[PDB]
């Protein structure tokens, strides 16, 4: 089903290698600098990478725009006594010292400008006490959390404190996920948009769920997410501003069914299921209610309006029609052109210098 062309398209819409090494080295350097700072030595507990970069669901920005990299700093502060503003203000001297003239505060996060990427770090705290805090800290200091490789590179990653990177000469025991009784009921607290109150977040469960869903779909979930994001970017004129980002990924993950064979079949099934599920809500002009993986009491589609959902539904209907007529076509060139009608021109059609010393 034109699999090599889809592979080339995916390779085209992925972030470049310079940006990848840039964000890896930046995360490692930031972690080391945070560890070595005396004023924040005891406060800081861990610093790990999150976001679509960690989950391998990120696309290449058009132009020279720097990609967004999400980082989390876990501290041992008490949120019941300290306001979010004080906690975020504890980090100003560090940014002024190590990153002069390149850092900026906005909303709930700080923004650091690197050579090719932009970091976006958030200050969080542990809401537990006693031995539960000790166990959570031991989990957060493990190699499973403190790794900088994406999910695509490590297909053997498991949320376990006894997991180690399996490296072979060319290509041992496969440890499994930890029981849900040890991590599922312990989320983290982070500041809100206005830095007036602490919210609840839990990204480790999101990473675990994404990895498991990718494993059950034979490594097609993240590629489908990237393809849908690229489709949204291309047809931006006829589509609303929202949903985008994590909510769009949540919709895609909900729509899919386990056991994906190929990318085109996966896309067709995804769009068909999406049209089938929310038809009743669409004809009533409302929006769905979807519960977050980490926190079950939160709605991901909380800030989305009904008209945005309706416009997205219409766009999905048109894309589903195009994909349906594209899949059935047997002529490779016609099918490739039909696929290019949606994805764009990046869907294909069927030097070392000398240095002496």
């Amino acid at each position: 089903e034109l699999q090599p062309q889809f592979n080339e398209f995916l390779a085209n819409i992925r972030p470049t290698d310079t940006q990848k090494e840039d964000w890896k080295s930046g995360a490692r350097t930031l972690r080391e600098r945070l560890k070595n700072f005396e004023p924040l030595k005891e406060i800081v507990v861990s610093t790990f990478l999150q976001g679509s970069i960690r989950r391998s669901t990120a696309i290449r920005p058009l132009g020279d725009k720097r990609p967004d990299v999400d980082i989390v700093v876990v501290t041992n502060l008490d949120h019941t006594r300290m306001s979010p503003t004080d906690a975020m203000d504890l980090f100003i001297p560090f940014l002024e010292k190590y990153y002069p003239g390149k850092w900026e505060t906005q909303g709930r996060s700080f923004g650091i400008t690197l050579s090719y990427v932009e970091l976006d770090l958030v200050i969080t705290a542990i809401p537990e006490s006693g031995a539960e805090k000790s166990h959570l800290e031991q989990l957060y200091k493990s190699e499973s959390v403190l790794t900088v490789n994406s999910l695509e590179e490590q297909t053997d990653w498991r949320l376990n404190k006894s997991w180690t990177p399996n490296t072979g000469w060319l290509s041992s025991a496969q440890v499994e996920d930890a029981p849900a009784s040890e991590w599922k009921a312990h989320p983290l607290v982070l500041p809100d948009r206005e830095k007036n109150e602490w919210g609840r977040t839990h990204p480790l469960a999101q990473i675990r769920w994404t990895a498991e869903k990718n494993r059950l779909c034979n490594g097609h979930y993240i590629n489908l997410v990237r393809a849908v994001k690229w489709w949204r970017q291309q047809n931006s004129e006829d589509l609303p501003k929202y949903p985008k980002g994590y909510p769009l990924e949540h919709l895609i993950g909900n729509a899919l069914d386990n056991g994906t064979t190929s990318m085109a079949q996966g896309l067709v099934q995804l769009m068909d299921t999406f049209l089938s599920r929310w038809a009743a809500i669409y004809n009533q002009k409302s929006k769905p209610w979807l519960s977050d993986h980490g926190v079950a009491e939160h709605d991901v589609m909380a800030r989305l309006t009904a008209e945005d959902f309706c416009s997205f539904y219409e766009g999905i209907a048109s894309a589903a029609e195009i994909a349906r007529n594209a899949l059935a076509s047997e002529e490779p060139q016609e099918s490739a052109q039909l696929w290019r009608q949606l994805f764009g021109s990046k869907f294909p059609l069927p030097q070392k210098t000398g240095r002496f010393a």
């Binding site: 090494e21 050579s115 000398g354 240095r355």
Partner: protein, 226 residues
């Protein structure tokens, strides 16, 4: 600021020996030299040593010559090839602050990128072009060495193309040629490299500069903005 740093130099050939000698003469006393080849008579056409060091390991002879310079010198030699095999050697290597590459080999860049340094270092890469017409200068301050960025910067610069006509065979009864470079060109580029190293150590960051020599005797510089 640079006289109190421990400096590690990889490659004790033409450029490396001159850079090390200049650094030892200007005050940098804690140096470590890493090389695993032997010195020959042909190498002396562009080198800092003499015939009394022929047949020795390059690193050991260079270290002795450096230690015979000033009464406060303290240099060490590593005869293995990067990266070392023993864990003790790696622990010894991780004690240095500034890492300088003067080999001109891509494998060394990849080995530097794949090595675990366990802390933040300053990485400097220096190499010459065909016929010694230019100089590549790259610098960074990270925990890991960025190789893709350095390679892209090297490829982006305008440099002479390699022509085999100017490449002379090393001698009678041999097959491999050698690259052309006179002693004065290497000395010029060694001085420029020492100045660049001092400037980078003063203000660490992501820096790339390309130098060019002109027939009238002038030196021009083309920087890169990040």
């Amino acid at each position: 600021d640079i006289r109190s740093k421990k400096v590690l130099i990889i490659g004790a050939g033409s450029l490396g020996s001159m850079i090390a000698e200049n650094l030892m003469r200007i005050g940098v006393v804690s140096q470590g030299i890493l090389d695993a080849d032997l010195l020959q008579t042909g190498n002396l056409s562009r080198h800092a040593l003499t015939m009394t060091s022929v047949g020795h390991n390059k690193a050991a002879a260079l270290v002795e010559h450096l230690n015979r310079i000033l009464p406060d010198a303290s240099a060490r030699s590593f005869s293995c090839a990067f990266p070392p095999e023993s864990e003790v050697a790696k622990n010894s290597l991780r004690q240095y602050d500034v890492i300088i590459d003067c080999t001109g080999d891509d494998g060394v860049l990849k080995s530097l990128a794949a090595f675990d340094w366990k802390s933040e270092k300053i990485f400097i890469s220096l190499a010459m072009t065909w016929r010694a017409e230019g100089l590549f200068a790259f610098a960074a301050s990270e925990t890991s060495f960025p190789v893709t960025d350095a390679s892209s910067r090297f490829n982006a610069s305008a440099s002479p193309e390699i022509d085999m006509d100017e490449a002379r065979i090393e001698g009678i009864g041999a097959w491999h040629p050698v690259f052309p470079a006179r002693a004065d060109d290497v000395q010029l580029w060694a001085a420029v490299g020492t100045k660049f190293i001092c400037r980078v150590v003063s203000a660490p960051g992501r820096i790339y500069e390309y130098f060019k020599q002109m027939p009238d005797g002038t030196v021009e510089k083309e920087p890169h903005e990040y």
